[PDB]
Each structure stands twice: as structure tokens, then as C-alpha cells.
Symmetry: D2
Subunit: 302 residues, 4 copies
């Protein structure tokens, strides 16, 4: 499918960008800019902006557009930029897609619309409408059954990823039989592994990249896994995945987004490491570990 | 809980009319509000799931809340569903509900992202504060929210200061009985229309539901029949409601209700917002026949 | 199938200190149930710990219960196994012992297609040799998720006279009743019995009927007479007991209550079920005394 | 328990058109596996249709397999039942027949507490009298949802030497390996074998190894050689076969391929399993021919 061929340039390891907030839970613009540069300096292939990790679903459309605009100013032409524009509403999703186009993003993406049960035909129309509003930007279908409640069959996934204008699939599923099945059906499809804690295994199963939240603090590790596997150095790939999972273990305990924001706070990137309500603060007993992790990561990096 | 005793009854979960451009249809909203008042409904639950809240902006939700208050304040009870995923957004809507003179606020357990139980409690606390004296109706709908509260957690939520009711959209009638047993004075709304009679028997003392927009009097009739010990009439009414619900599930529930209301000369354009699609045209004869049946009744 | 309508205790299987069948306690439990005014017994079901018994042990229980109670109350033999052939054996034995009906749980563990489920029931019905089949639906334990349409096909199979509906979905209970006005339809979850009857069930089969079957008969009566408050009160009292039994473990909690009622010598379930925690013994003792004083 | 590390076929149990054990085909299937170069056999498991056989039938199969294979390849006896006592009888029999290890699925149908699962394993381990235990985790069929902490407790019980992990959660696979660097850890889902090895499994137990065990051994080899492309190519070929087997039904599909390889006389599973849809026979025959020519 030629739409898959035309999206070849989107293959890679893309950080799901966090949205920094200030003490009053408004956008912290200076921290957002610092975070974008910090990701570029890690050697990340691109950014996935306004996704789950960006706390999109506790932001308004206007807030999401501001983030999109700022990220484009900072990063357009330097690394790939995918705009997650998905809302429950098709119309809202289209507005964000239109804005992504205006700001010069390389792609758009939409989570399968959630809360209300929609038919598969309704899902397909949703993506079509957003693709039209994206005005040439390729679409990354975003599948995350754990949070969306949307339970697509493989046949449905196949239809979705071959809609005109779709160039990739962000597969946030731990089912690696299905990962292999998708690769086998679509040999040229850009296929992002969505769960960071199985990245090496997802690549082996057929993913050709990833999009993840933990890439913000250790994206070079995931780059290092791609490299190890390409060279056939399985031991280095396993070692890196194991180190990633030790960190993921801690972030699951602390809360993932806020744990990441706190680590980035000790890396001097984020000024105030809060998520938006109803997310609460990181428990203070985890602070030594998170600071320790921040120190560990800079020392292996710098 | 005995304070909020005035919130007991059968409250329609109000639909939000739209036009073919997907804009709010305010004329049809007003007509639908009056249609519900004329049916003898006890109140309206505004901007809930049935109201298509989660495909509207805050401004749109506020516009609807305002119009309903204009139409119905003082005539029937008004509950504003103000729930968003965001606490701050939910607080804005709660403050607006207060301004418009609603009798109560409500919020669905915040969804998509997993939140801890403590995070849920703080969310409700913050909204109650912004409601500034309006009692809170905790809204539990596990099937759509993905939030799996334990009974003990439900107990903690419903006894938070400012909480006067639970909207229990759950088919587990053991838990319905357990909630009634623990909280003898709690206003407890049955949320699944197709078990209303059984929910009342288990302990609910009223309900909030989408199908009440077209046949609210049948649910009042179940309440009446059960108060008089007339099981047979209660069962017959529930069976008739379920015959309708079978059809609505086939057609799509919100858009089916809006189509019935369209044939009743209430709603101009029976559309839901995208990504909801239109009613399959093969169902229109059944939906029209139903409107006629219900009007004659 | 109309004569199968009613309130039937899901009989427990008493065991001795060595986990073998305690035949004397079994006989005592059967009589105890008859004296409570139960309409019948459902023997060798989930509650009977069927799935930790051999086929010969299950036959032994069936034979003895028939000795005790045949002619006096209705007797339904749960003959269900994963294996069809094993299920057929028990069905043939039920017929020999003179049971009024057979029953089989949807076969579990391995996923079977719906037509495989249908063939399974057909085979068991053939082996039942004229005994009506009670289809037994319990999704929470069986893992089998039948659609309403599939339930409709199952309950209309030649030879099927009833459905034991162990589901808390009371929309579906009403739908089943509406589709099949004459079907015998047993409410399976004790803790919604009053509500299940209201939705369309015309009786029930349950584990807690062994210790308070008269309360459920009382709910049927109260509803028949339009005494909704009495029905609700009885359901509430049943649910207070069910709360405790869920804490203690239901089969062993029931056996322990029956032990304090002088019916069951040794109130053990079969391994891997463990014993009742000793800290719940005062509550279960208090419960037996209350129920005995209640009659 | 390093000696248990490897690629072990979950042996199918052949039956005839009467649904009786086909012992001649069992012996042939055992020999066929040995000649494929399999490391061992896991006997009377899910794939062996344990849960539609009597204890005696399961014992007969265990005895025959030991006769054919003892000392030539590793032998693991799946002795698991819902009942602890039944599981203990099979464990004692496995010991008598000279098996290298025993295994038990988490007991299913009735909800048991985690303590009750542990005591179940302790009892089976005692009856195995020195044979190491392979804890068998298969959430999708058993309905038992163990936490990582619970799995950690189980795999460290005295006498446990391995975990059969039939779960597609490869985060947990990695976590288990991280916690227990020396634990024998079998990948249970054949269609993610290469990925499970990468996450931390050090071998596997699977149903499809009966017809293409050498491919899985080839994946283990390719990964140790650091040849990722060959590991992927092999996994892709295994999944093309698995796609077909899932369409046909896996056990009966495997038996049908084996039939065309002249190993199994009658490719039937026991009722309530039905026969293969005849429209799939051309595909299943061609697969047999392909696989015979490849080996």
C-alpha cells in the first residue's frame, strides 16, 4: 500500500512528550522548551506531542494547540514531529489536525475515540474525517486497548491501517503475536512499539520503532537497543531492556508521568514536576530514589 | 443524607439536541425540557453521558445548563452533571451550575487515566467546594468509566461532606442492596433503565435514565405499582420498557431516542455528534410506530 | 417441565475427617432440607463440590439422596463434566436412581464452539433417557460467555425443560422470560433472589438454601401476595448472612453452620479448599443459634 | 534444576473413533518427537487433553511414555487436577514410572485463595517425593490471576525447579528472570517464543513442537549465534502455521498434520471437541508434506 511507502520517513524512536506545568497548573512554556531540546540532545528521532503522556485529556483544545505551536518553533526541521490530535469528538480532533498542519507537523495521530461505544464503521469515519483535515499529513492510528476500552480485531486493525492517508500504527499492546501478525500483513507499515517495558521483544516481533513516555529521560537506551539488535548483539539489547525495566518498575510505583517529571526536575529541565488534577503529587518517600535515578542517568549520559 | 431527601425521584437524563451542522439546537433543547416537564418527570440530569457531555466543550455544556435552568428552575429538580476528566474543568462547570441555580451537581468518576482512590476522593472534594452548597451526586458507571470501585470505596465516596446521592449505573443488585443497607437515608438512583423495577426492589429509591425522555411516566408507574404492592403492573411496565430498550440498543440508544422525539414533534434533527453516526434508515418505521404508540398512550 | 418450578437447595457434600464421603451426614442434610419445606434438591452441582469428586463418588451421592428423598421432593442430578462421555455416564446413573431431571454446566477450561456446546447437551439428553435437562449457566466460574441468542437455542433443544441462570444480569433474566414464557427459570445468585424473581425467574437453586431455605420460600410467598416490604426484609436478612459466608468462604461456612445445627459431623471441604479461619467461628456459631431459634 | 532447561513438546494424547486411548499412536508420537531432536516431553498437560481423561487413563499414558522415552529425553508429568488428592495420586504414579519432574496447573473453576494454591503445590511436591515441580501458569484458561509477588512466592517453594509461563505479558517474563536469575523459565505461548526468549525465558513447552520442534530449537540456536534475522524468519514461519491451527482448532489440527505424517491413526480429540472441518484438510495435508520435506 503506497500510503505505507510514503510514510517510511516516520520510522524511528519517538519520545511521547510530557507537558510541563507551573505551580498554578498552567503551561510552563520555558520548561516545555527545555524538555524539547533535552530530547533532541539525547539523539531521539522525533516527538509525539499531545498524546496520553502529554496529559492531553486534561487540557483544552487551545492549550493543546499552544503546546503544538511551541514544539514546532523549537523542533521543526530538526527532528520528526507527530501531533496527537485525538479527542472523543471528531470535530475537535479535526481542529487540532488543521492546527498541526498550520504549524508544520510531519504527521497527525488519533487515539481510537473512547468512553462511548462506537461501531467499527464509526471509528473508520472518525479517522477519515481527521485525515481530510490533516490536509496531506499522514495519520498514525493509535491503539491502546487498556485505556481506550476499544477492542479491535486483527481484521479491523488491518482495515484501519490501510485507510487512505494512514502511514503508521502506534501499537500500545503487549500482545506480540498480534505485533508479528500486523508486520506480516503490512511489510512496509511503520509500526511503533507502545509499551516501553517490552521494547526489545516488540522489535523482535516486528515493530520497527517505538513511541514511549520513558524516552524523555533515557531515549538513548532505546536507540541503543535498536542498534544492538541491528548488529545482532542480543546480550547488549537484553542488558539495556533490563535497565529500562528497572526504571519502569520504579516509575510504576511513583506514578509514571509524575515520576518522569520529577526525574527531569533533578536534571534541571522541568521547574515544577506536577501533573494536573486529579493526578496527585509524587509521594515524598520516593524522592531519594528519583534523585538518585536522575544522577545515575546524567553520569552514564554526560 | 436525610437532608438531600428532596433529590429522591425519577429524573430524565436529558439529551442535547444538535442540528445538521452539529451545532447546539437551542429551540429543540427548550422544547425537550418542556416535554419532560409535561410528562410528570421529577427532575432533569443535565449534561450527563446521555447528554453527550464528552463531545461538547465546557462553553457548550454551560450554554445547555443555562437554558435548562431558564426553562425549568423551580418547576422540577435540576441536577447538573459537571464531571470532566480534569478536576479544574469540572470545578468551572460546578461554579456555573451554582450561578444558574441548579439544585445539585454530579460528576462521573474521572476516566481514561487510572487514578488512585484517594485521587478520586480529592477530585470530588474539589468539585463540592466549587459547587458551594449544591449537593453532589456521585456518578458510578463502571462499564464506560473503567473505574472499578470496591464497596468500601463507594462507602467512603458517598459519605464525603457534601455528597447527597449516588447515581448507580451498575447491574449488580447485590451491591445495590449493600449500599442501601449501609446508608439507609442515601438518595440512590438506579442507572440502568432495563432493570429499574429490580433495582428499586434491591434498594434504589428512584432513578436517572436516558429512556425517561420518551416514556418517563412508565417509570413513575413502576414506582407507583411497587408502592401499592402491585407486582404484576410493575413487571408489565418493565417488560414494555425493555421491549423499547431492545429496539434502542439495535438502533443506537441516544440517536434512537432523538428519532422518537423527532416523530413526537420535539427534536428538529435527531442527530448525535460525530463520531456517532446516523440511525440506519431501515429502523425508521419501527421508531415512528413507537412514537405513535407512546403518544397515544 | 412445569413440575420442576420452585426453590431447590444446591446440596452440599459432607465429608469425614479423612475427606471421604460422610454418608450419615449426607442423609441428615437431605432430611434437614426436606423439613425446611424446600421443593427439591439439586445434587452434585458446584455447591456439591462435584469437580473435586470422582464419577463413582458423584454416583454414590446421587444414589443415596434418591434413597432418602425420592417421592418426597423433586431431585435434579447435576451430571456435568468437561467430558461429554463422563457427563453421559452420570446422566445414565441419574435415570437408574430415579431422578426427576438432569443438569449440566456449560463445559469449561477448554474453549468449545457454540455448536460443540449444543452437541454436548444433545448427547447428555440422549443418555438421560427421558429425564429433562436443566441447562446450567454460570459465566463467572465457567468462563463461557453465551449470547442471548445462544442461550435461546440451548434452552429450546429437544429435552430441555429449564435453565439455572447463575448470572447477575437481570436485563437478560427478563429477556429470557419474555422469549420463553413457559420455561422453568431458576435464579442462581442467592443475594439477588427477590430481584431475580421480579425480573422473571420463577424459582431458584442455591447454596444458602441448605441453612435458610424457608426465607427464600418466604420471599416467593411475599411477592405472590404483593407484600414487597416483607420480601425486601427477607432478602436483606439473607444478604446479611451471605456477606458473612463470602468472608468465611461459602461452602465451608455453610457446612460449619450446619455442624452447629447438629447436621454435619465434620464441616470440611475438599483440598485445595482450606478450613474456616477460627476467628469467624463465634459469628457462625451465633448464626446457627439465631437460625435454629428462628424456627 | 538446570537439567530441565530446554524445548519440550506438550505431548498430544491420541484417541480412536471410539474415543478410547490409541496406545499404538501414542508410542509412535513419542518416538517421532525423540527423532525430531526434542529435549523432552510434557505429558498429560492441557495439550494432552488431561481434563477430559480419567486418572487411570492419565496414568496409562504416563506409564507408556516412560516405557518409550525414559533416559532418552527429559520427562515431565503434568499431574494437575482441581483436587489436591487426585493430583497427589498422579504425582505418586509419575514417581513410580521414573519421570524427571512433575507439573500442576493452578487449580481452576472454584476460586481458591493464594495460600490454598501454595498448600496445593506443597502437597503435590510431597507426593512427588523428590521429583522437582514445574508450576504451570495459564491465566487465559485457568482464570487464576496471580500477581508477580505471588508468582515469586510459588517459584521459591521448596521443591519447585521451574515455571511454565503461558502468558503473553513479556514485561512480567522479564521481571521473573530478573528476580530469579537461575530459574528454569518455559515460554508457554508458541507464537511469541522468540520474543519470550529475548525477555528472559530459557526454553519452552508448547503444543506445536509436536510437528515442528526443530524450528523452536533453531530459534534458540539462532539467538545464541546472534543471528536475529534467522530467529525472526523461523518465528514468522511458526506463526503462519499457528494462524492455520487456530482456524482449524489447535489440538485437532496438530493431530491431523500428525495423521498425514503417518504418526497418528485417527486425529480425533475427545468430546465435546468436534472433528476438523473437512474444508481445512487440503491445507493441513500440504503443511504435513511441506514439514516432512523440510526435515
Amino acid at each position: 500500500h503506497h500510503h505505507h511507502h510514503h510514510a517510511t520517513n516516520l520510522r524511528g524512536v519517538m519520545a511521547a512528550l510530557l507537558t510541563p506545568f507551573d505551580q498554578q497548573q498552567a503551561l510552563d512554556k520555558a520548561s516545555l522548551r527545555r524538555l524539547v531540546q533535552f530530547n533532541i540532545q539525547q539523539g531521539i528521532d522525533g516527538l509525539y506531542v499531545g498524546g496520553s503522556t502529554g496529559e492531553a485529556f486534561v487540557q483544552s483544545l487551545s492549550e493543546r494547540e499552544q503546546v503544538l505551536e511551541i514544539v514546532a518553533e523549537e523542533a521543526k526541521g530538526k527532528i520528526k514531529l507527530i501531533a496527537h490530535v485525538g479527542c472523543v469528538s471528531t470535530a475537535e480532533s479535526q481542529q487540532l489536525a488543521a492546527s498541526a498542519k498550520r504549524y508544520g507537523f510531519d504527521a497527525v495521530s488519533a487515539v481510537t475515540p473512547f468512553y462511548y461505544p462506537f461501531s467499527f464503521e464509526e471509528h473508520c469515519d472518525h479517522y477519515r474525517a481527521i485525515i481530510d483535515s490533516a490536509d496531506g499529513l499522514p495519520m498514525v492510528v493509535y491503539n491502546i486497548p487498556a485505556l481506550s476500552g476499544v477492542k479491535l480485531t486483527l481484521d479491523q486493525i488491518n482495515t484501519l491501517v490501510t485507510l487512505p492517508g494512514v502511514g503508521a500504527l502506534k501499537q500500545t499492546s503487549g500482545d506480540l503475536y498480534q505485533m508479528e501478525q500486523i508486520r506480516r500483513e503490512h511489510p512496509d507499515l511503520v509500526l511503533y512499539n507502545g509499551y516501553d517495558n517490552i521494547f526489545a521483544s516488540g522489535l523482535l516481533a516486528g515493530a520497527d520503532g517505538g513511541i514511549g513516555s520513558t524516552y524523555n529521560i533515557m531515549g538513548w537506551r532505546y536507540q541503543g537497543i535498536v542498534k544492538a539488535l541491528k548488529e545482532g548483539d542480543i546480550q547488549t539489547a537484553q542488558k539495556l531492556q533490563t535497565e529500562c525495566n528497572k526504571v519502569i518498575d520504579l516509575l510504576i510505583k511513583t506514578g509514571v508521568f509524575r515520576g518522569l517529571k520529577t526525574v527531569l526536575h533533578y536534571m534541571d529541565v522541568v521547574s515544577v514536576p506536577l501533573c494536573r488534577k486529579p493526578f496527585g503529587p509524587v509521594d515524598e518517600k520516593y524522592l531519594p530514589e528519583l534523585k538518585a535515578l536522575a544522577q545515575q542517568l546524567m553520569q552514564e549520559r554526560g
